[PDB]
DNA sequence: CGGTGCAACAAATTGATAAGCAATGCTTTTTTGGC
DNA sequence: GGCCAAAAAAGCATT
DNA sequence: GCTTATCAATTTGTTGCACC
């Protein structure tokens, strides 16, 4: 139970025939390589579906058209795997893991009355090492949001005097910033194996 | 290529609970690039 | 697309 | 071990992107 980056990109190839397979995979990987570019050092605002479309164009020369099924395709499939109870681990950039949550003490924030948090299987997304580096390295950039899917902003982090966990020597560490990953809608509803049922619907 | 509309976003409240993390060497998984 | 040895990234320890 | 994130219900303002 769980997917890498070529295994994705194999999915992604065996659906998109009318596209030859070397170019599906350029395209996750220049995806991916846009993705974490904005997130380290940005420049080009928010990255959204249509700005890694523009840029496969630009990029590797494909059609508006095909950049765009491809783009949504990845995302798409990426959800799938989670959704079946499947990790997704993309080398370079982070992974995709489920995680059961058992109910827990909550309550309305703005009233006070206690309101329990449900038992749940949520989607985290944990930032690899050579995606970190390149956050704090670079300094951040902007953020990256994809509705439905989810979306990446960056976290700040004070300096502080940390500890070398082996020795238990001091370290100062600086400031820096962390990507952050925040499930949407979509793929919080179809990876919780509890709410495949009547929905949340009403006015008042 | 450009204008609209609207559900999916961000931010904001509190507070109990769950998850992540500083350094860094050895082990394991993944990818890379030739053939 | 499969093989393969080497390089890179991740996994683990503990994080 | 200490720090950061998770989440509840609900409103106010923003924006991705489907659809003209
Ligand atoms: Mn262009
Ligand atoms: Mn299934
Ligand atoms: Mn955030
Ligand atoms: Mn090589
Ligand atoms: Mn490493
Ligand atoms: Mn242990
Ligand atoms: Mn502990």
Redesign the pocket.
């Known amino acids: 139970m ?1 997917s ?7 999915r992604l ?1 065996t659906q998109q025939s009318h596209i030859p ?1 070397k170019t599906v ?1 350029d395209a996750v ?1 220049e995806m991916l390589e846009h993705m974490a570019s904005t997130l380290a050092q940005g420049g080009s ?2 990255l ?5 479309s523009e840029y496969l164009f630009d990029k590797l020369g494909l059609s508006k058209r095909d950049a ?1 099924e491809l783009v ?1 395709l990845f995302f798409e499939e990426i959800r799938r795997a989670l959704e079946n109870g499947e990790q997704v ?7 995709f ?1 489920l ?4 109910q ?10 206690d ?4 038992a ?1 299987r ?1 989607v ?1 997304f ?8 390149r956050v704090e390295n670079a300094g951040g950039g902007e ?1 990256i ?7 990446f ?1 960056l ?1 700040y ?2 300096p ?1 005097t ?6 238990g ?1 001091k ?1 100062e ?1 600086e400031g ?1 910033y ?1 990507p ?9 509803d179809r990876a919780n194996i509890y709410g495949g049922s009547g929905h949340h619907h009403h006015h008042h």
């Open positions: 769980a890498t980056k070529s295994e994705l990109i194999e190839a397979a995979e990987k605002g928010g959204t579906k249509a700005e890694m765009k949504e681990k993309l080398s370079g950039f982070g992974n893991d995680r059961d949550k058992n827990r003490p909550g309550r309305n924030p703005k009233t006070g009355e309101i329990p948090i449900t749940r949520v985290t944990r930032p690899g090492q050579k995606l970190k580096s953020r949001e994809i509705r439905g899917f989810g979306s902003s976290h982090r004070a502080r940390g500890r070398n966990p082996k020795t020597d370290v560490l820096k962390v952050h990953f925040k499930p949407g809608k979509e793929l919080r």
